[PDB]
Amino acid sequence: AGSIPGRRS
Amino acid sequence: AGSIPGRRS
Amino acid sequence: MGSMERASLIQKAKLAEQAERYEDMAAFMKGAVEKGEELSCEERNLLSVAYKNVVGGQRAAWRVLSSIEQKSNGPEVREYREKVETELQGVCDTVLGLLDSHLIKEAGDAESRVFYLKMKGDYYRYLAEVATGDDKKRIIDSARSAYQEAMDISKKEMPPTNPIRLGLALNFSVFHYEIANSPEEAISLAKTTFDEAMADLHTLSEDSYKDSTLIMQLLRDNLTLWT
Amino acid sequence: MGSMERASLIQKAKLAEQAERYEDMAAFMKGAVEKGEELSCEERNLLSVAYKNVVGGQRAAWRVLSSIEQKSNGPEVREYREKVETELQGVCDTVLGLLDSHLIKEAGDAESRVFYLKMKGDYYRYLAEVATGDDKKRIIDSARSAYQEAMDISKKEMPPTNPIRLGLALNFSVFHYEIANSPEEAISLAKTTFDEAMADLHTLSEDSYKDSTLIMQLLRDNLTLWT
Numbered sequence: 336a337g338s339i340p341g342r343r344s
Numbered sequence: 345a346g347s348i349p350g351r352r353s
Numbered sequence: 354m355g356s357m358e359r360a361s362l363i364q365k366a367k368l369a370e371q372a373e374r375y376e377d378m379a380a381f382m383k384g385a386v387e388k389g390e391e392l393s394c395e396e397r398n399l400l401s402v403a404y405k406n407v408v409g410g411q412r413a414a415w416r417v418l419s420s421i422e423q424k425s426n427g428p429e430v431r432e433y434r435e436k437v438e439t440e441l442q443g444v445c446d447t448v449l450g451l452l453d454s455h456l457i458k459e460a461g462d463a464e465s466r467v468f469y470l471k472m473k474g475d476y477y478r479y480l481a482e483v484a485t486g487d488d489k490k491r492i493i494d495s496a497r498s499a500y501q502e503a504m505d506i507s508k509k510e511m512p513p514t515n516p517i518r519l520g521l522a523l524n525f526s527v528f529h530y531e532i533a534n535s536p537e538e539a540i541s542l543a544k545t546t547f548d549e550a551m552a553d554l555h556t557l558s559e560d561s562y563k564d565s566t567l568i569m570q571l572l573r574d575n576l577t578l579w580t
Numbered sequence: 581m582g583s584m585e586r587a588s589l590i591q592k593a594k595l596a597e598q599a600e601r602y603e604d605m606a607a608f609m610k611g612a613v614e615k616g617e618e619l620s621c622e623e624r625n626l627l628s629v630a631y632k633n634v635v636g637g638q639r640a641a642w643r644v645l646s647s648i649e650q651k652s653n654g655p656e657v658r659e660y661r662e663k664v665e666t667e668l669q670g671v672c673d674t675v676l677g678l679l680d681s682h683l684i685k686e687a688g689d690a691e692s693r694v695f696y697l698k699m700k701g702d703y704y705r706y707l708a709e710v711a712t713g714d715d716k717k718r719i720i721d722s723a724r725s726a727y728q729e730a731m732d733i734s735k736k737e738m739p740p741t742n743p744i745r746l747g748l749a750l751n752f753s754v755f756h757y758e759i760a761n762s763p764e765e766a767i768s769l770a771k772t773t774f775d776e777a778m779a780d781l782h783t784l785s786e787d788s789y790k791d792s793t794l795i796m797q798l799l800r801d802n803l804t805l806w807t
C-alpha cells in the first residue's frame with residue numbers, strides 16, 4: 336500500500 | 345572514470 | 354539555526370534538496386519555522402519533503418531490522434532496532450512539535466490548515482507503526498483525529514481534485530488499511546475519493562489535470578492491491 | 581563505542597549495512613578498530629564499505645554544490661558547499677587517523693598492508709578532490725606515496741589477478757587521470773594491469789575467475805572512456 340511519495344519538491 | 349564502487353560487502 | 358537569516362535557511366534547504374542532503378534540509382526548514390513567521394505554499398512543501406525523506410529512510414531501516422529481529426525470535430539486533438526506533442520517534446516528535454508550536458494554530462487558510470493537519474496525521478501514523486505499549490491506541494487515535502479534522506475542512510473548502518485533498522485521502526486510506534485494521538473503510542474512502550475527483554476533472558487546466566490525475570493513479574494502485 | 585563489545589560492534593556494522601545505515605556502520609567499525617586488535621579480511625571490508633559509502637554521499641553532494649557555485653560565479657551556495665566540504669574533510673581525516681593509529685603499522689601480511697595503503701591513497705585522493713590552497717600539492721603527493729607503496733608490495737607479493745591488487749591499480753589509475761593530470765600514465769597502468777591479469781586467469785577457480793574478471797571489466801570501462 337502506497338502513501339504519498341512526497342520525496343521530491 | 346570509475347573507481348572501485350566498493351559500496352557493497 | 355537562530356543566527357541564520359530566514360531567507361538563507363530557505364535557500365539552503367533548496368540546495369540541500371538538490372544535493373539529496375535531507376537531514377540538512379530538515380534542519381534548515383526547522384530553523385525557518387522557528388523564525389516564527391507563517392510558511393508559504395512552497396515553504397510548506399520544502400518542510401514536508403525534508404522530513405518525509407528523513408523519516409522515510411528511518412522507517413525503511415526499522416523494517417529491515419524488525420524483520421531480522423522476528424526471524425531470530427544475542428541482544429544486538431533488538432538493541433540496534435531500538436536505537437533506530439528511538440531516533441525515528443525523535444524525528445516524529447520534532448515535526449509534531451513544530452506543528453504544535455505554532456504552525457497549526459496560526460494556519461487560517463484551508464490550504465495551510467489541511468496541509469499541516471495531514472502532516473500531523475502522517476507523523477502520528479509513523480509513531481503508530483512502531484508503537485506497542487500503553488500508548489499505541491492513543492497514538493492511533495491522535496493520527497485518526499488529525500486526519501479526520503483535515504478531511505472535514507478539505508471537503509468543505511477544497512474542490513475534489515485538489516492535490517492536497519487527494520493526498521490526504523490517500524494517506525488516510527493507508528491509515529485505515531495498515532494501522533486501524535479497517536480495510537473496508539480504506540477501500541471505500543479511496544474509491545469515493547477517486548470517483549469524485551474523476552467527475553471534477555473537466556474543470557481543470559492541462560497542468561492541474563496532470564497534478565490531480567497523478568495522485569488519482571496512486572489511489573487506483575492501492576485499490577488494485579486491495580481488491 | 582568504548583563500552584560495546586568488539587563482537588557486538590562488528591555484528592551491528594553488518595546489520596547497519598543491511599539497513600543501508602552507513603553512518604552507523606562507520607561509527608560501529610570505528611569503535612571496532614579502536615579496540616586495538618587487528619582486523620580480519622571480512623572486518624577490513626566492513627570498515628572500507630562503511631566509509632566509502634559515507635564519503636561517497638558527501639562527494640556527490642559537494643559536486644552538486646560546486647557545480648551550482650561555479651554557475652553563479654549571495655554567500656549561501658559557497659557557505660553550504662564549504663559546510664559539506666568541511667564535513668567530508670573531517671570524515672577523511674577520521675579514516676586516515678585510524679590507518680595511522682594504528683592499523684598500518686600493525687599490518688604485516690601483504691593482503692592487510694596493501695589494503696590499508698590503498699585506503700590511505702583513496703582518502704588522500706578525496707581530500708585532493710576538494711583541495712585548492714597551500715596544501716593541494718602535498719595532499720596529492722601523500723596520495724601518490726601511499727598508492728606507490730601499495731603497488732610495490734602488491735607486485736612483489738600478490739598474483740596479478742588478486743582483486744585487491746586489481747582494485748588498487750584501478751584507483752591509482754583514476755588518481756593519475758583525475759588528480760595528477762597524467763592521463764598517459766593512467767592509460768598505461770590500466771592496460772598493463774588488465775593484460776597481466778588476463779594472462780593469469782587460467783590459474784583461477786570459477787569463483788576467483790568471477791572476482792577478478794569483474795574488476796578487469798572496470799579497468800576496461802575506463803580504457804574505453806579514456807581512449
Ligand SMILES: *Cc1ccc(C(=O)N2CCC(OC)CC2)cc1
Nearest residue numbers: 339341398516517519520521564
Ligand atoms: C500530501 C501531498 C499531496 C499532494 C502533493 C502534490 O502532488 N503537490 C503538487 C505540487 C505542489 O506544489 C508545487 C503541491 C503539492 C504533495 C503532497
Ligand SMILES: *Cc1ccc(C(=O)N2CCC(OC)CC2)cc1
Nearest residue numbers: 348350625743744746747748791
Ligand atoms: C579496493 C577493492 C578491490 C577489490 C574488491 C573486491 O572485489 N573484493 C571481493 C571479495 C571481498 O571479500 C569478500 C574482497 C574484496 C574490493 C575493494
Ligand SMILES: [Ca+2]
Nearest residue numbers: 357358359360
Ligand atoms: Ca532577519
Ligand SMILES: [Ca+2]
Nearest residue numbers: 584585586587
Ligand atoms: Ca571485550
Ligand SMILES: [Cl-]
Nearest residue numbers: 432433436592
Ligand atoms: Cl545499538
Ligand SMILES: [Cl-]
Nearest residue numbers: 391459460461
Ligand atoms: Cl494566519
Ligand SMILES: [Cl-]
Nearest residue numbers: 365659660663
Ligand atoms: Cl551553511
Ligand SMILES: [Cl-]
Nearest residue numbers: 618686687688
Ligand atoms: Cl601484525
